[PDB]
Amino acid sequence: QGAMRIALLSYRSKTHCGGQGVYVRHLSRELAELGHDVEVFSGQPYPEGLDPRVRLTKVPSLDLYREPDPKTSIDLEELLTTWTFPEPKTFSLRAARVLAGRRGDFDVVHDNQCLGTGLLQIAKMGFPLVATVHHPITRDREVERWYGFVEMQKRVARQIPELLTVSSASASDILTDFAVSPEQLHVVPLGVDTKLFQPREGRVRNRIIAIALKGVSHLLHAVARLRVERDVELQLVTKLGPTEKLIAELGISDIVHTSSGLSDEELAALLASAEVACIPSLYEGFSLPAVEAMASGTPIVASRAGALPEVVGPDGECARLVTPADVDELTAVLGRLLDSPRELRRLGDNGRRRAVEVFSWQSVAAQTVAVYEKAIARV
């Protein structure tokens, strides 16, 4: 009962990454809105828009992977400066030093996919420990920084009784790789601000939107072929001559408009102004654009790639599912959906309901508190 004291740990918290910062920013605000007191412990990159009701404690580390630059006065033995990726291992160690000073000041210690050895020391100090695993890094597809730290993560997550993952696709890939118990896992997805992301009663005719491997090339041929029959327009949200010179080759530089660095408000207006959102294999473990499109009442055309059929409702409810590499299938389903005015409304109404029913940040925060209480009950 009362305001729970929660320590939210995140070794990295980039403002725009789906996990790390966005997860930390939205979860902290909603936990504080529920009435609990949240204190976030973060390292570089430090978070940005945290709620004033949320306190931030900087855990400094040598950010040798800084964007401007890739030193004799290093103060801690945790500083490894090993060119032989120790940041998750070192963050959990430095967090154990701060957690020892506040042994009775926190009810739960929640981890944001750090999974370091120092977290096991925090649980040894009496802290109930919960860890959120967004994406199992055991997927060393690029093998065909160095992923030696993931061997430490699987040994830690296997001993944290309450584990949080965002989708069943990430849960199954954790069962296969991390060898974690199934009871150990609690699937709680990511949410969206259903107040900010909502229909706005004005949709431009024949306007598609896509937010960003990335199958954007397949969508670019779709809008290129759709131009002859329809006044199609693509609002592409990504930062980009680069590889996307397809815009020049297809002559679609006029109907394709690129935006980047948009705030959540600017994105919500654009995402609600479009008649359809396309998610072509845009799977970073969890599709925040799909949730943000459903919340806006915008029907989706997505690929059958991982958690997209799970996040998006069944085929024919919130979206139409297509085969990823198939350019022509994507082109036929888009045009047939764009030529149907009754289907754009039905899928959009069902997408708003599901977003409100399933993917609201408040519900995500409420389900997280439930996982918190399970770790408290075992202490």
Numbering used by the authors: -2 to 67, 77 to 90, 93 to 152, 166 to 233, 239 to 266, 270 to 408
Original paper wording:
Mycobacteria synthesize intracellular polymethylated polysaccharides (PMPS) of 6-O-methylglucose (MGLP) and of 3-O-methylmannose (MMP), both proposed to sequester and protect newly formed fatty-acyl CoA chains in the cytoplasm, thus modulating fatty acid (FA) metabolism and indirectly the lipidic cell envelope. MMP is composed of a linear chain of 11 to 14 units of α-(1→4)-linked 3-O-methyl-D-mannose (3-O-MeMan), blocked in the reducing end by a methyl aglycon, and with an unmethylated mannose at the nonreducing end. Using a combination of MMP purification and chemoenzymatic syntheses of intermediates, we identified the biosynthetic mechanism of MMP, relying on two enzymes that we characterized biochemically and structurally: a previously undescribed α–endomannosidase that hydrolyses MMP into defined-sized mannoligosaccharides that prime the elongation of new daughter MMP chains by a rare α-(1→4)-mannosyltransferase. In this elegant mechanism, MmpH serves as the recycling enzyme that hydrolyses mature MMP into defined-size smaller oligomannosides that are, in turn, substrates for ManT and MeT1 activities for further processing into new daughter MMP chains.
The structure of recombinant ManT from M. hassiacum was determined at 2.75 Å resolution from monoclinic (space group C2) crystals containing two molecules in the asymmetric unit. ManT belongs to the GT4 family of retaining glycosyltransferases and displays the typical GT-B fold, consisting of two Rossmann domains connected by a linker. Most of the C-terminal domain could be modeled in both molecules, while the N-terminal domain was almost complete only in molecule A (hereafter, the structure of molecule A is described, unless noted). Accordingly, the N- (Met1-Val209 and Trp390-Cys411) and C-terminal (Asn227-Phe388) domains of ManT display a core formed by parallel β-strands (β1-13) alternating with connecting α-helices (αA-O) and form a deep crevice at the inter-domain interface. ManT transfers mannose from GDP-mannose to tri- and tetramannosides (independently of methylation state) being, to our knowledge, the first enzyme to catalyze the elongation of a polymer with α-(1→4)-linked mannoses. Despite low amino acid sequence conservation, the three enzymes belong to the GT4 family and display a GT-B fold. They display particularly striking structural conservation in the nucleotide-binding C-terminal domain30 that allowed the identification of residues potentially involved in GDP-Man recognition. In PimA and MshA, this role is played by Glu282 or Glu324, respectively, that establish a bidentate contact with oxygens O2’ and O3’ of GDP-Man (in PimA) or of UDP-GlcNAc (in MshA). This signature residue is also conserved in ManT (Glu321) and its critical role in catalysis is underscored by the complete lack of activity of the Glu321Ala ManT variant.
